[PDB]
Design a protein around this ligand. Structure first.
Ligand code: HEM
Ligand code: HEM
Ligand code: HEM
Ligand SMILES: [Mg+2]
Ligand SMILES: [Mg+2]
Ligand SMILES: [Mg+2]
Ligand SMILES: [Mg+2]
Ligand SMILES: [Mg+2]
Ligand SMILES: [Mg+2]
Ligand SMILES: [Mg+2]
Ligand SMILES: [Zn+2]
Ligand SMILES: [Zn+2]
Ligand SMILES: [Zn+2]
Ligand SMILES: [Zn+2]
Ligand SMILES: [Zn+2]
Ligand SMILES: [Zn+2]
Ligand SMILES: [Zn+2]
Ligand SMILES: [Zn+2]
Ligand SMILES: [Zn+2]
Ligand SMILES: [Zn+2]
Ligand SMILES: [Zn+2]
Ligand SMILES: [Zn+2]
Ligand SMILES: [Zn+2]
Ligand SMILES: [Zn+2]
Lengths: 161, 161, 161, 161, 161, 161, 161
C-alpha cells in the first residue's frame, strides 16, 4: 500500500524519538548498575526494551506503507550525571513524544489512516505511563530526600555493575 | 579503575560499529520479512541481537574503566535493496570490524590491558563467523542462482511480515 | 591365534582402504559444510563414521589373529572440487573395495577362515549400500540439474559451517 | 614438565597474594558478621572462597610445571576496624594484584608459556571485578552516608554472628 | 576470508600431528585391550577421540581461512610393544606439539590472527594435560613396579578384546 | 535417684531465672508487636520459646533427681519502655545467668553430677548466644542511630498487633 | 563479652595450628594428586577442609569473646617428599595439638569458661581421629610394604592431577 506522505513523515519522526529513547534508557540503566543502583537499573533496562518494541512496531508500519524507516538519525541524548538528572532527562524525551503524538494522532485520522492512528494511540498510552512513573520518582525524591530514595534502589547488601 | 585512554578510544570506536551493525541488520531483517523472505529474516534478526549483545559487553567494559560510552555516534548505514546487496552491505561492516580489531587486540595487550583484549578477541571470533556465513551465502547465490537461492528463504507456503 | 598370512595381508589392504575412506569422506563433509550444503554434509559425515567403524572392526580381527594393523599407510585421496566430483571420488574408492573384497571373501573361505570372510561379507554389503547411494545421487543430478539438486542440500534458510 | 624459572617465581608471588587475600577476606567477613552486618558478611565470605579457588588453580599449575608451591609465606594483613577501612584494605591488595599481573601476563607470553598467561588472564579478570565491586561500595557510602549504607548490610530484623 | 599464508602452514602442520596422534592413540588403545589391560584401554581410546576433535577444530579453521586441509600426510607412528613404551611413544608426540605450538601461538598473534592463536592456545592446554597424565603414569610405574602398575589396568576378573 | 542437695538448689535457682526470662521476653515481644516493630517481635518471641524449653529441661532433671521444681517464685521483671531498654533488660538477665552457671557447672562436676553439669553447659552456651545477639543489637543502634535501626525492625509497609 | 586473657591466648595458639594444618594438608593432597595417588588425595583434601572448619569455629569464639583472631602467624610447614613422610608430617602436627589441648581444656574449665572448653573438647576428638587414621596408615605401609600400599591409593586405571 502507499501510505500518506505526511503520516510517513510523522511515523519517521516518532521512530527517531524511539531510537533515541532506546539509547538514552539503555545507557542510563547501565550507568545505574555501575553506581550500585542495581534494583533501579532493572527497571530502567525494561523501559529500554519497551522502546525497542516501539521502534519495531513503527518500523513495521512504515514498511507496510511502503515508506523508508530512518535508522540513521538520532536526536541528542541527555546523559544525566545523577539519578535525579536521569529521570529528568528521560522525562524530557517522553514529553517531546506527547508534543508530537497529540497532534499526530489527530493528523492520522484527518488523513483517514485509522490504523496508523491506533498504533500511535497505543504508543502514546505507553509513554504516558512512563511519564507517570518518572514524575512520581522525582516527587518521591523530594519527599524522602535523595539519600533515602537512593537507598531504595540498591539490593541488600549493595551490589555492582 | 582508570582505563588506558587509547584502549577506551578503541572500545568506543568498536561500540560505534556495533550500534551501527544493530541498526543495519535489524532493518535488513524487517525488509527481508516484508519481501516475503521470512526464513532468512529470522536469521538476520538473530544477527542483530548478537550485535546488541556486543554493544552491551563493550558498554560494561567502558564503564568499568571509567570511560564514557558513546551512544550518540553512528556510522553510515548501507541499506541494500536486494538480498545480494544486503549481504554485501553487512559484509562490508564486518570487514571494517576486522581492520579495527586485528591491530586493536595487539594494542590492548601492549598497553597491558589483557582483559579488554580478551573481550575484543571474543567479539572478533563472533564477527569472523558472521563473515563466514555472509561469504558463504554470496557463494551460494552464485551456485544456485538468485531466484533458486531466494526460494530457500521463504516458507511453505510463502508468508509475509 | 595365528592368522593365515594371506588373510592378514588382505585384512590389512582393506584397513588401508578404510583409513583412506575415513579421511576422504570426512574432508568432503567439511567441504560441503563450508559451501553451504549443510544438509548434504550431515550425510557425508555419517558415511565417514561408518568407515571409522569398519577400520575398528578390521583392526580387532587383525589383533585377534596376532597380526599388525597398519595405521601408517594411506592411499591417494581424491579431493573433489564440486559436489559431482565428490560423489565420483567417493564412488571410485567404494569400487576399489568391491574389486578387492569380491575375490577376498572367496580367498578367506578357501583358507578356511570363515570368520574373517563373514567380517568382510558384512563390510562388502555396507559398501554396496554406499555405492547405491552415490550412484543414485549422480543420477539425480542428471535428472534435476546441478543447481536444483544442490538446492535440496541446503537448509531453509541456507546456513554454513 | 619443567616450567620457566621466572614464570614459576611469578606464579608463586601471586600464590602468596591469594593466600593473603584468603585470610584478609575471611577475617573481614567474620568481623562483619560480629558487627551485625550479616548481609554484607555473606558477600565478603564469598570473595574469600573465590580467593581459595585462585590459590588452588595456581597451586595446580605450579605443580604441573614441577615447581614448589609456597604455602609458608604471607604478606601483611590489613585488618580494618570499620566497613570503609575494610573495603579500602581489600581494595589495596586487589590493586597490588593488578600491578603484578599486568606485566606478569606479558612476561608469560614472552616466555612462550601461553597456558600460564591464560590462567593469570582469568585471575586478572576476576580481581578486576572485585576492584569494581569495592570501588562502587566506597562511592555508595559517600552518596548514601555511612549510617544509611550500613543499614543496607543488616537483615530485617538486624541479626548477628 | 584469506588466511595468512604462514598461519595456514602452521595449522596444517598441527593438523598432521593430530591425524598422527589419532592413529597412534587409537591403535595403542586396541593393543591395550588385546593384552587384557581393558581399564587402561578405555582411557587411551578417549585420548584418541580428543585428538579426533582437535583434527576437526583445526580443519574448520583452515577452511574458514580458505586453506587446504591436508588429510594426506601422516608422521611416523611410534607403536610401542609394552605399556611403558606406549606412554613414552605418546609422550614423544605431545612434546612435539609443544615445540611447535609454543612459538606458533606467538606467530599467530604477530600476524594479527588472534582467533587462530586462541584456537591453538586451547589445543596447547589440552596437550599439556595429556603430557601431565603420561608423565604421571611413567612415574607411577617407577613407584609401584611394572607388574603392580599393570595390575591396576585390568578389571576384576581380567577381561579382553 | 536422690540428687545432691546443693545441685538441686542450683537447678532450682536456674529454673527461677528461666521462668523469669520467659515472662520478660514474651512481654517484650508483645510490646514490640504493639509498637509496630513486628519483624523484631518475631525474634524476641522465639527467644521466649527457647526459655520455655530451658525451663522444661531443668524441670525434668529436678524431677529425675527427686527434687521439687519451684514454679512459684519469679525474680523482678525489667520491662523496658524503648527498644534499647528492652535489649538492656534482657541482657541484664542473661548476664545473671552467666554469673550463676559459670561457678555452677564447676560445682556440679565437684559433686560428681556430670549429667547436671552437661545440662547446664548446654544452657550456658545457649545464653552466651543470646548475649552475643543482644550486645550486637545495642552496638548496631549506636552505629546506625535509633531511628534507622528501628526502621529495620518494621515490615514493608509497617504492620501492628 | 570479655573473654579471659589466657583462654584467648590458648584459642589463638590453636588457631595458628589450624591455619598451619590447613596449608600442610591442602598442599599434601595436591602433591598426592600430582603423584597419581588420586584416591588418597581425596581423603587428604577432606582432612584439609576439616581444618578449615576448625579455624572457623575458633575464629567465631575468639570474636564472641572480643579477642583478635590471629590470621598473620603460621608455624613451620613440614612438606613431605614421600607418602610415608607426609603421614609423618601430618601426624607430627596432630600430636602438637594434643600436647596443647589436653592441658588447654583443663585450663578453660579452671577459668570457668566451659563453653571454650567444650569447643576445644570437640576439636580434640576430631584430631584424635586424624591421629588414629594416620598411625593406621603408617602401620599398614609396614604390613603391606610401600609399593603395595601405594597401589591402593591409585584408581583403576591409575589417574592424575
Ligand atoms: C535499532 C534499535 C534497536 C531495535 C529496533 C532493537 C530491538 C530489540 C528487540 C525487538 C528485542 C527483543 C525484545 C524482547 O522480546 O524482549 C531486543 C533485545 C535486546 N536489545 Fe535491542 N534494539 C535496538 C537497539 C539496541 C541497542 C543500542 C542495545 C544496546 C546497546 C540493545 C540491547 C538489547 C539487549 C541486551 C536485548 C535483550 C538481550 C537478548 O536477549 O539478546 N538494543 N532489542
Ligand atoms: C581423519 C581423521 C579423523 C577425524 C577428523 C575423525 C573425527 C571423529 C569425530 C569428530 C568423531 C565423533 C565423536 C567424537 O569426536 O567425540 C569420531 C568418532 C570415531 N572415530 Fe574418528 N576421526 C578420524 C579418524 C579415525 C581413525 C583413523 C579411526 C580408527 C578406527 C577412527 C575411529 C573412530 C571411532 C571408533 C569413532 C566412534 C565410533 C562412532 O561414533 O561411530 N577415527 N571421529
Ligand atoms: C590455605 C589456603 C587455602 C586453600 C588452598 C583453600 C581452599 C578451599 C577450597 C578449594 C574449598 C572448597 C571450594 C568451594 O567450595 O568453593 C574451601 C572451602 C572452605 N574454606 Fe578454604 N582454603 C584455604 C584456606 C582457608 C582458611 C585460612 C580458612 C579460614 C577458616 C578457610 C575456610 C574455608 C571454609 C569455611 C570453606 C567451606 C567449608 C566447606 O565447604 O566445608 N580456608 N577452601
Ligand atoms: Mg509491501
Ligand atoms: Mg567505577
Ligand atoms: Mg591375542
Ligand atoms: Mg609431574
Ligand atoms: Mg569460505
Ligand atoms: Mg523418680
Ligand atoms: Mg561482640
Ligand atoms: Zn516509545
Ligand atoms: Zn517511553
Ligand atoms: Zn559485533
Ligand atoms: Zn557481526
Ligand atoms: Zn568401509
Ligand atoms: Zn563405504
Ligand atoms: Zn584472587
Ligand atoms: Zn580478589
Ligand atoms: Zn591434539
Ligand atoms: Zn593430546
Ligand atoms: Zn535460658
Ligand atoms: Zn536466654
Ligand atoms: Zn583441627
Ligand atoms: Zn586434624
Amino acid at each position: 500500500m502507499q501510505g500518506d506522505p505526511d503520516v510517513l513523515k510523522l511515523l519517521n519522526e516518532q521512530l527517531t524519538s524511539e531510537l533515541t529513547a532506546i539509547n538514552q534508557y539503555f545507557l542510563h540503566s547501565k550507568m545505574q548498575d555501575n553506581w550500585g543502583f542495581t534494583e533501579l537499573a532493572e527497571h530502567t533496562r525494561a523501559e529500554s526494551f519497551e522502546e525497542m518494541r516501539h521502534a519495531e512496531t513503527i518500523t513495521d508500519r512504515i514498511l507496510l506503507l511502503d515508506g523508508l524507516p530512518n535508522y540513521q538519525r538520532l536526536f541528542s541524548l541527555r546523559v544525566g550525571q545523577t539519578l535525579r538528572e536521569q529521570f529528568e532527562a528521560d522525562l524530557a524525551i517522553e514529553y517531546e513524544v506527547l508534543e508530537r503524538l497529540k497532534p499526530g494522532i489527530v493528523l492520522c485520522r484527518e488523513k483517514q489512516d485509522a490504523t496508523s492512528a491506533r498504533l500511535l494511540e497505543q504508543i502514546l498510552a505507553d509513554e504516558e505511563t512512563h511519564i507517570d512513573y518518572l514524575e512520581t520518582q522525582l516527587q518521591l525524591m523530594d519527599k524522602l530526600g535523595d539519600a533515602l530514595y537512593a537507598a531504595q534502589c540498591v539490593s541488600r547488601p549493595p551490589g555492582s555493575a
